């Protein structure tokens, strides 16, 4: 939503510490998607659960590839996020 501060790119469960890139820095990588209804050249918004869903987008995130499924609910999609819209 409008409360987005950044994206967690790494995690360490032993120390329970999340390494995060701030929203002010652009990123290109694989993130969790809500479902498999995301195609290339699609505007994406973070939901209340922190998952990327197909589109009032405060940030400008565009999918580079299609949703790829590994588990029953795991959907990884390559996305480039490069700031906030206006």
């Amino acid at each position: 939503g409008e409360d987005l501060y950044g994206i967690c790119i790494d995690i360490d469960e032993f120390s329970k510490t999340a390494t995060i890139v701030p929203i002010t820095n652009n990123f290109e990588g694989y993130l969790v998607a809500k479902d498999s209804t995301v195609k290339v050249k699609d505007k994406l918004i973070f939901n209340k659960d922190g998952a990327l869903e197909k589109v009032k987008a405060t940030i400008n995130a565009t999918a580079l590839t299609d949703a790829k499924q590994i588990s029953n609910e795991v959907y990884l999609v390559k996305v480039a996020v490069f700031g906030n819209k206006a």
Binding site: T24, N25, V40, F82, G83, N84, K85, A86
Partner: protein, 151 residues
């Protein structure tokens, strides 16, 4: 072309030191930090000294950058290698201060990128630090500092 391909007829006079930077060959920024994030992308057309936007093909080939602006603005092209067809892009997240192409304007004016990657007076993107300088009949440059997107 950033470097004039046509050969000069005369040797330059390297005696003066003033007004020797208002040239189209000047690549990069007037003030450059060592912590600036720089990317390289395939160049579609000639986006040099212009705002760039990401364009995706049919999926067979990877994404490229094309001269543009508006809501699709992705960054600012500050340099280009012609042999490899590669455009150097500073992301819109990173701030830039330097000479950029201006649509054919006074200091303090708020400038935004148009559909062709050219700055124009008014969301704002930059603030003019000088006036328009004419290099060719339709080529105008301006010193602007870009600080991202803000309404």
């Amino acid at each position: 072309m950033k470097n004039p391909q046509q050969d000069s007829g005369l040797l330059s006079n390297s005696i003066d030191f003033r007004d020797q930077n208002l040239i189209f060959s000047n690549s990069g920024g007037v003030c450059t930090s060592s912590k600036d994030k720089i990317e390289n992308y395939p160049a579609k057309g000639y986006p040099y000294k212009r705002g760039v936007k990401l364009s995706f093909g049919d999926g067979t080939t990877e994404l490229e950058v094309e001269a543009g602006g508006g809501d699709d603005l992705y960054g600012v092209c500050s340099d280009i290698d012609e042999f490899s067809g590669m455009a150097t892009v500073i992301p819109i997240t990173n701030n830039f201060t330097g000479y950029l192409t201006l649509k054919k304007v006074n200091p303090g004016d708020k400038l935004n990128f148009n559909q062709h990657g050219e700055l124009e007076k008014v969301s704002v993107n930059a603030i003019a630090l000088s006036k328009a300088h004419k290099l060719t009949e339709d080529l105008f440059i301006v010193l602007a500092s870009v600080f991202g997107n803000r309404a």
